[PDB]
Amino acid sequence: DSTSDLIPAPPLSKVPLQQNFQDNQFQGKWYVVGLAGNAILREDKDPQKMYATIYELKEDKSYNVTSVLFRKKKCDYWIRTFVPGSQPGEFTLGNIKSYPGLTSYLVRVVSTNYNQHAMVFFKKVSQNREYFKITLYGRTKELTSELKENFIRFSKSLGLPENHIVFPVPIDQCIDG
Numbered sequence: 001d002s003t004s005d006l007i008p009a010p011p012l013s014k015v016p017l018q019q020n021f022q023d024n025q026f027q028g029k030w031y032v033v034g035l036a037g038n039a040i041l042r043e044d045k046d047p048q049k050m051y052a053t054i055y056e057l058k059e060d061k062s063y064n065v066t067s068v069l070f071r072k073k074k075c076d077y078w079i080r081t082f083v084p085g086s087q088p089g090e091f092t093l094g095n096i097k098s099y100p101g102l103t104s105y106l107v108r109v110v111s112t113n114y115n116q117h118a119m120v121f122f123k124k125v126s127q128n129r130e131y132f133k134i135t136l137y138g139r140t141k142e143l144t145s146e147l148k149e150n151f152i153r154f155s156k157s158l159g160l161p162e163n164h165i166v167f168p169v170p171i172d173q174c175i176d177g
Ligand SMILES: C[C@@H](CC(=O)N[C@H]1CCCCN(O)C1=O)OC(=O)[C@H](CCCCN(O)C(=O)/C=C\CCCCCCCC(=O)O)NC(=O)[C@@H]1COC(c2ccccc2O)=N1
Pocket: 032, 037, 039, 040, 053, 065, 066, 067, 069, 078, 079, 080, 122, 123, 124, 131, 132, 133, 135
């Protein structure tokens, strides 16, 4: 039992796709330099720590996806599989049945130069609620003012206000591996 109110997912027509997506070049570690979405909330009192997401291409060309976060003095690892979708740069979630209440999952790479930065859009339906987020990925933990403002502009263009747009604080634990 619950009640909740969410900013609606934008139509997919407002979400560009990186042209000529190169899956081999997108591999490796990305830091989450910026975070936005309808279930993302700024918390000034206990700000979000930076985490990292590693993309490894398997032999079948799906990604093994591992996220690592520092929490409760430990490194927590989350693993999922991204299965190539309708066009290059889009993915759906492998083994969706193993996740209760999850009926829909989409990933679209919005833009990337592969060696410094990226913006990725995620949309899912979980317990019948439609969630979305955008990640600003960094090859390093810091990015230019220009790339952060572009990320803000894009997030706002999808209906998100500033208090749904977070810039996680760089840390050293867990994510420098
Ligand atoms: C626990 C707690 C705090 C936490 O540490 N969350 C992290 C875990 C580490 C990966 C980053 N991330 O998105 C988190 O949620 O999170 C939660 O209880 C719930 C419910 C949890 C349900 C399952 N879930 O949301 C997952 O994300 C499951 C596995 C994550 C690995 C997949 C690859 C991640 C790539 C995307 C990325 O780079 O961020 N999820 C969330 O709060 C966040 C906020 O919005 C979303 C979300 C929204 C739309 C689409 C995808 C989403 O993950 N998840």
